[model samples]
Target: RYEEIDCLINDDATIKGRREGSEVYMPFSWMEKYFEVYGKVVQYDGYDRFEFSHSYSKVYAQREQYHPNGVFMSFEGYNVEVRDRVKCISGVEGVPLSTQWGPQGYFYAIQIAQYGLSHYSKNLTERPPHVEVYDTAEERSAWTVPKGCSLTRVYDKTRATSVREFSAPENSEGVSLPLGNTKDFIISFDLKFTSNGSVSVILETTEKGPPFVIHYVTTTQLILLKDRDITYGIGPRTTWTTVTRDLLTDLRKGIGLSNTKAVKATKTMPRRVVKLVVHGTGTIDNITISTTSHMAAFYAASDWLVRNQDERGGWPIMVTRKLGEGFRALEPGWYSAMAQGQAMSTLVRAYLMTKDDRYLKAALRATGPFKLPSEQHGVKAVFMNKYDWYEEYPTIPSSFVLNGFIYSLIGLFDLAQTAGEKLGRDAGQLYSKGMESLKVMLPLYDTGSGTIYDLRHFILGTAPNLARWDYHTTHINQLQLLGTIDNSPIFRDSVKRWKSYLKGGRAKHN
Candidate 1:
């Protein structure tokens, strides 16, 4: 049985014509393309009514209808309905649907038929409005550049000078200075600022080198300076008294370290040690010594590490004996991985700041063992103890271990590249081999969905209950640290991915 609905038709017999006094009508054919997949039209009941039913389901429904004044409407069984009546064309009739009965009763109906070619059309191609997909480049570069690397000018110099003046009887062949240290060299030049306000430094080296020399070109900004440092630039033909004063003034201004406080602070407290415990057991025992003499306390602490390494080539967790003898031993393997990683990182940081080979050597020694595949895997397993010892310990591994390794590797890469012959052939070989190993291991912790897991055990199906929130913060911190040490695009991409994961509530799931 079927319910038959009656409708009054206007004299306009065209199929696309609008009803004389009704709100129900069809929209444009181009707009109806969205609904065409549902079915084909059966017949038209003059300009007032049209009869169309889907092959599978017999139902009376307005097709692609819009309000006369473009106001959306509500209908029974549908969230939207329209009641405003005006002379408006129907889309099917290529004319406006008309409405004269204002806010009155209007209805539409359908019939149920038997065996009428039942069909099911899959909406495999249609995508929801809320879902958005993007290419790789658009997904990356979502954040601005990081801190600590903002560019500033040393002297407004632009031009490379061609003059080679050698200082005889210095400590080493590369040494060209009145500073008299084999490790130091001097380059005399003037900085010139260009018309466009960009600056460049003219380097007058003691040896005839390349025509144009640009120093320290990075993605963030450029730094052009006549001399690298005051200590390295004092030469036989040059007196650094003026430049040294400038250097001290610049250092104080840039770092916000006061000279008056520094002098008084050095008198009272010569050196202070701050022990920072990382993870559960590892420590970054930093030593800060104040001196009125020179810009050298930071350099001295770094040099001290290189001079005092044990026969096993590792520093004790606590350098200050005030902490007692218990702190002298190398920490547990897991802690050692983190401690050594950080020590190497400090060396790299020190090297970048001071360009010292001693720091590079220290970095090489601390990082050498972990680069070996067997040693690396063993340390990773220890770091991943949470997953491996799940039955016994019942805890999730910390993501900091993977991050620590990445930091260590970045430091090692820098040291290997910058240390020249000081890193030694063996250390260089180990660094190369270690990098290859890391390339294979880095992706294991990559969770494919943006957030990386804390440990390989999580990747290998050991810690299923570990929460993403537990590790995402640590992962983001590591990515920030990596970006600082090495401005790699991979690290940039990782940072962007982590931010997206955080925004999308990826951390809501374990």
Candidate 2:
């Protein structure tokens, strides 16, 4: 709680530098903070600052390594940096620190210590809230691409003694590789040449022309063949040492983000491949083709989310606390309704996949915390967003988060849809209230301007709270997801306007 000790840190009782809050702020602008100076409250006396690096007050380590969020720096050493040669600070300079701590996940403590005012820093240690291991091929499935879902077109020319060798004929389409037709695919392979020659590869379609191509004209120069055609360039004409090394240049097209939707939808498509024609011989070994199966990554993310669910059924996304007029305390390992609702979305996704009540139970458990008394600030509303999340309040007496509120609705909608269709009951009031709030929300934003202020102060309508000023990219993307699921014109409309702004380079900011 920075505010608890804000006075001790800031030259308070003064006029200027009147920044507010622990997380979000507007010295008339949303803070551009990645780092900040700390106060001497820790007793180190020098400038003790909270390096906004992930400083989690959670459990130690995860799967051999996890980025750290709980690291403190005391710069007694001052404006310059120095390390190793000097003595270091103790983890318990006067406090009890969990043995596990490191910042930015990994970095020798020496670097930071040297730049600091302190001669030494408690052993630079970092710990993630929790650690869950990975799944080996044996547990999930082999790393091999799934059948039908993905296909591999390989050209292997390797033997125990020697490799395949074929000098390219002056006029011949050397070796043609077979491929399935898909909107998205990745091609990677290793090649070896016995003599210097020219080789060109083209991805041809049954009709029209090759959509992608690459060419190599001799040993040193490789060219990208596309948009039309390309000519080869000849380099030094010599035996050109066998150069046990590899001379390589690679390529692809109409892929990546342009084709992200197909991967995300987990839909598979068919495509074709071609033979690489050459003037000399070369062996193609360990050739590989991959049609990115979006579903694979999707499932992995879901599994990771499920495996990391905290003991409280919430994802370790938010921490809660009870506040009395002035003193505030963390609820320890608990989460916020915002985190729960977001987490519930994941659980419902699992339920959608497995119809497992366990997931539903775990997800619903997250909803109760924000129900009332709850929630925060003692006020209750069905589809309200959070302002006091993680103990960072923008405008207090606290407020609401339209952004969090929307996710809450979406989560409850998915849950209620599942329960109604399978178990014969609505996911309950959360769903209905969520929908009502959503409909109630449409007119609240200045969508024509593509500006949506975040917090809803009590009931006075909406004001720029935390996200007072933003690129609007975050909410726009969220709206896109919600629009896709609900097929609502309101959601869709806002998404369209904001997306245009995003496309226009996020120019309009309010």
Candidate 3:
């Protein structure tokens, strides 16, 4: 079934990636490396901090005019350009500003300004100056030693002491121990009670008091002393002036949580705690306390993606029935061919990011097709004599599609560039044969005018019919690329004529 997949944290510390499947006849170990020579140089923008775009490669974050874009830059190049007014989520963190009109659903960042792609995005407008470079860690960066926090040896089980006896007298004041820093935090310790009644607790000064308290209502339910009403933490609170043993028992085994997991008692905090003063509690054994930050919160989005991957090696793209409508048709999970290509493109980029072999394996399955020898029969798109790919739209021999083949070509190229001689050699021969076919295929342009016919078949003479310019660009862009790689003058020049017509030129023939 065509289902969405996410990455998973692997036991090896690396994530057990929910691999995305690809075209069956498609393989690209070679595509990964050849990208070094010349291939797709892309950019992203208007991205939320949560967006990774798989490669998260050369990227730019921007907002429209007026608002100073707190744009984030991700790449190996140019300085960031942020305008005047800039704002976002706190602590050097936030998603890139996005408008519905942006590219890829997210706004377009900077152009893929590098290598051969330099001139490609020149038509794009200059971005504002309020820019910030892309930060992978955001504020969820590695934990730094918390400030103002001091560590001390309060208790050691190996010591010749049971409890340090802080209870000097009934009016015995608690010891004041101050650690530095103030922030949301969690501190844990072990505790035991001897002659427990409404035991008065301790208080620290100026810090996050992860719910610190001063008085335990003496006994579970001593009496109606005062309306010992209370509230703690930013969250709501639980209260009861009555500490009847039975009532306490009800409170204990009570609430939905396990007793071991329940918060035994709480005190209304008047100030942020900076130091702790234990009253009769000097007899305490293990003591632990500290200030903190919500660092893990950073990986939340990324982790979710990993966890959602289906058990299958690939991401699922589900489709509905009555799928095709007229002449179209789809099997159970047949979502989309382009979606498959787009996915493989990202998988290739992601694998490059982590250098994880599992992703490579996943890409193999994502694009994997079992039969290669079927191409001559005209039902399949085969790369090598063995690797076969399924072309979705147009339904094979019926419609010679430009989009499906071009998209698959790009994906196949990505896999081929990765670097592995065996795969590289295999991919080259595989792709070279494809180019051979494409070189011959493109010339069907017989129009002699710069305009090439998008469709050519035994029956469909040269006509637009259902063809689109999107398919036109896909074919042209790839033709130039393959011509460059295969050194085919015919295909290269063919690119010029098509480019000419795309611009405003005329035909070479009548």
Candidate 4:
């Protein structure tokens, strides 16, 4: 059965990730690093703080003209002359400002800008300021701290032990305690019931479900309540029982989630104890939430990719799956261009961390599948015997999956830059060929109202698979990027037409 796979937080704190599973693969690790760096939960009485430092080798910014007819500067370089489109290099797509008409029409905070132009041109005409030299930007940066560093900052920065006392509280809904937006944290507090009717400590989340409740009865039993499910006796407690628990782990058991779903939930959904309610005549003291950093997981995930790559330089989708129509299905050991490309994209980044040859060689090896043909169980397919196209899912007639091919092309570009002149030429040539074919075939993807997901409609005589909103957005983005990589009016026209589709604009139905 084709079950969807994703990143699982290992017992060792490492993330076991999959290709299509992780969306863009490396973002899983990046998100881990993000949580580690910014994972602090401040408590009024008790709290835990988790933060780390990211030491990149070098960083710079480029200037461009946008709103207010002013020169706005950002990292890296983006040429606004060509259709006022920005190539999203960082995988973070630029938001459409108002209309996709002028230089001031789009916005991307984490994107690269032109490297060397100090000031805007003499006047702001139809075209924005154009710069030839590309320099200093965050995107053109190498890491100084490749091995994910942790901060030694103190966890406790609170004053005298302050306690909030609730004496026979009238409201049935207890006093709410903020959870500090952290999934993994240790919360400990002292509770004493003077004249009690069973004080309850409940945890509420943004997710839709029954809240996790802990009942501290006047008797000697601590009860755990989740939805209709109930677990008796977590601990024998009555008066002033100093209690502590791990939020992330407890959340898993409380919600009955698999390890994979637990990790995915922490990242995708907000599992932070948004509201911790204490009611029913009790005095809670020394209340605190402590968060632990998982900085090591970042490098652990990167190393997994390096160590896990097969001899063929590609990551295999170990499950059997279907692509487009059932006529072209994938076996258990099928390889994907998207996976291969995204994996290389990750490897090249890993290589940059310390300029390691192992990472570079692994990426170099991944290019092997792209060079071969689909007939030989590879990712390449010839369209009409004239154009070379890379298949995301190497189906029989070939499913020219748009996003996967573009992702592969971007990966090749990354490899070419990192692999240097001699080793990179082959990748560069492949990139050019793929881009050329993509330019010619891009129009075929456009429907009057939306874009198709793949060319299976043309290849296997099936109906056109209309791209979802997200996929359609990605198509416009990839074309915008192609416009940046290679100056093509086709990419520009396609982007403009596609952007219009997002609005009320639609092509006439035949």
Question: Relative to the unseen true structure, what is the C-alpha lDDT of residue 502 in candidate 2, on a scale of 0 to 100?
Answer: 31
TM-score of each: 0.31, 0.35, 0.38, 0.49
Which candidate leads the pack in TM-score? 4
Per lDDT, the best of the predicted structures is 4
Error of 4 at 70 (Å): 24
lDDT for each of the candidates? 0.31, 0.38, 0.33, 0.53
Worst 10 residues of 4 by lDDT: 88-97
Residues 162-264, candidate 3, lDDT per residue (tens digit)? 3333333334343444433233222322333333322332333233534334333223221122223221111111221111111111121111111221223
lDDT of 4 by residue, 1-510 (tens): 333444555444544444553363434355646443222344555756544332211111213212111222221123321122321111011111111222222221111111111112112222332221111123322111112221111122242443454533434444454544444444556656555444344455555776555443444322233563323233324455555443444443334422221211233223554435544554555555555211122233345556656787766655555654455667756677876776666566557766788878988888988988876867898999999887787888777889889878877887887888999888888888998898788888888877899887887777888887767876776666556556668877888778777654787766
Off by over 4 Å in 3: 1-317, 320-326, 335-337, 370-390, 394-397, 424-429, 445-463
Candidate 3, residue 87: Cα displacement in angstroms equals: 26
Overlapping backbone residue pairs in candidate 3 total 75
**TM-score of candidate 4 versus the correct structure, residues matched by position:** 0.49
Residue pairs with backbone overlap in model 4: 46-288, 48-289, 60-136, 60-137, 76-113, 76-137, 77-113, 77-114, 115-135
Can you give the lDDT of residue 508 in candidate 4? Answer: 70
Off by over 4 Å in 4: 1-298, 324-326, 507-510
Model 2 C-alpha lDDT per residue in residues 181-235, reported as the tens digit of each score: 3333334344555556654545553335544444545533222333534323333
The sequence of per-residue lDDT tens digits that candidate 1 reaches over residues 287-389 is 1111121222223334445664554555433211121121222222222344454445445556666676776667666654453322232233333332211
